[model samples]
Target: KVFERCELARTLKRLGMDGYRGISLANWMCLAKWESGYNTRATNYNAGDRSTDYGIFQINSRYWCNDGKTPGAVNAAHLSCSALLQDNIADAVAAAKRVVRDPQGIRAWVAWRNRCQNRDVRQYVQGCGV
Candidate 1:
């Protein structure tokens, strides 16, 4: 996850979201603490679809598969998870950076995290230090 996160951060930074380079490691630590309690096997109880996603970032394969421009390569299984775990943080970060650099993009992520604060309360609290 550490390697993946770094790669993701690099990717995001390359896509013009250099702000991520400023806060990604801290944000990743906060996100992991909350999302999986650092557990790689975590899953959401409310996720109704067997198509549920897993891993440190809790990235839904389908969500990651589409970048709102061109859809990524598809597979029969959780290819997103596979890809992420394959340490494709560079790719993910690139996508995130692109999204973030857009008008209101980084702010949108802030809003999302704020709204979901309770879900990741511990990490959210930790984010204060970040």
Candidate 2:
């Protein structure tokens, strides 16, 4: 459910990721799961208050949204910004693919995802559904 949107798929594909390979998909799933449970509309509520940050990555609204341009879920600009914040998918893929040319960025991406997931299995499982 993480990349359920066709547009998101196209976006990833534009970065040359046809699909996740082995641990890369697994790691993306884990990170997305940990971050927002695959809920595209997910938002943060720090201290029981609504955090302006929202979306699958829980990116801060201040950073991802501006001037009400990113009003709701599925903001391409917001998602692209998140991609930039994380590291351009192409660059990230290239970095990972350099060493792991098989599936390329799969394992490396997963490793990076694990770092972001913070090794929280519960969070990962809850969000990504095992």
Candidate 3:
């Protein structure tokens, strides 16, 4: 479920990510690009915290989804971490929206902070017709 750049951009826009929490489509695209390279099944295990990041958006198990590993983990989105790994990203999108409902918005992902924030993110959707 690795998506092409423009394909993911249009899909995210269609899923209401264009301006969710005031975050633009290109920024979201940038996050996905840096987070998981637009691959739906991507994952990262953080040994430091015993938490795992799951799916395209890499929603963390520490404070978002329950992975039964992190001590302080909570099912804040009320979903199992595995749900975020599906090739279809609706669940992952919902979880991402939930995370941004907090004050951090899209900055909830450090990947976005380090790579996309205040950067030229528009190139991610340059010709996607989004």
Candidate 4:
């Protein structure tokens, strides 16, 4: 599923991410844009670790979610990685919140480092009035 940028912003805000859990909504919105372009089914395979990133937030199979086939899977979210690749994002958001609370915070996402960190991303939610 693909959400309009504003729609995604609103959803994130409703999820209590509009500055909840020490993460700004604009920051998360920007990260989502760079990570998955708001597409729920986005997936990226990492050859180096032989793991996969799933869903809009790109939660990883190596730790955050389980791919089932991966050896030594440590699924912090306690859910399948495939669950993130769906239109209902409640699970995805929950998992992402866990990542945000980690010491790395939003920096857990490379896209946030490369695109959103230290940048004023207020424009990401400007039109949404969030």
Return the TM-score for each candidate structure.
0.41, 0.36, 0.96, 0.96
lDDT of 1 at 114: 62
Candidate 3 displacement at residue 77 in angstroms: 0.8
The C-alpha local distance difference test score for the whole of candidate 2 amounts to: 0.42
Task: Give the C-alpha lDDT of model 4.
Answer: 0.90
What C-alpha lDDT values do all the predictions have?
Answer: 0.44, 0.42, 0.90, 0.90
What does candidate 3's lDDT look like per residue over 34-117, in tens digits? 899999999999889888999999999988998887888788999999999998889999999999999989878898999999
Stretches of candidate 1 above 4 Å error? 1-18, 21-24, 41-50, 66-79, 86-130
User: Model 1, range 7-97, lDDT digits (tens) per residue?
Assistant: 4444344555434634444454455555555445554533443344445455544444321222343422324444434444444444444
- Kindly list the per-residue Cα lDDT of model 2 for residues 1-130, writing each as its tens digit: 3444343434444555434343433445454445565555565544433235445545544333332433443332433433423422443243333334443333333434556544543333233322
Clashing pairs in 3: none
Between prediction 2 and prediction 3, the one with superior TM-score is 3
* Candidate 3 Cα misplacement greater than 4 A, ranges: none
- Give the deviation of candidate 2 from the true structure as CA RMSD: 10.7
Error of 4 at 92 (Å): 0.3
lDDT by residue (52-115, candidate 4, tens digit) is: 9999998999889989866677999889897899899999999998888788988898889999
Q: What's model 4's TM-score?
A: 0.96
Q: Rank all candidate structures by their TM-score, best first, as comma-separated numbers.
A: 3, 4, 1, 2
lDDT of 1: 0.44
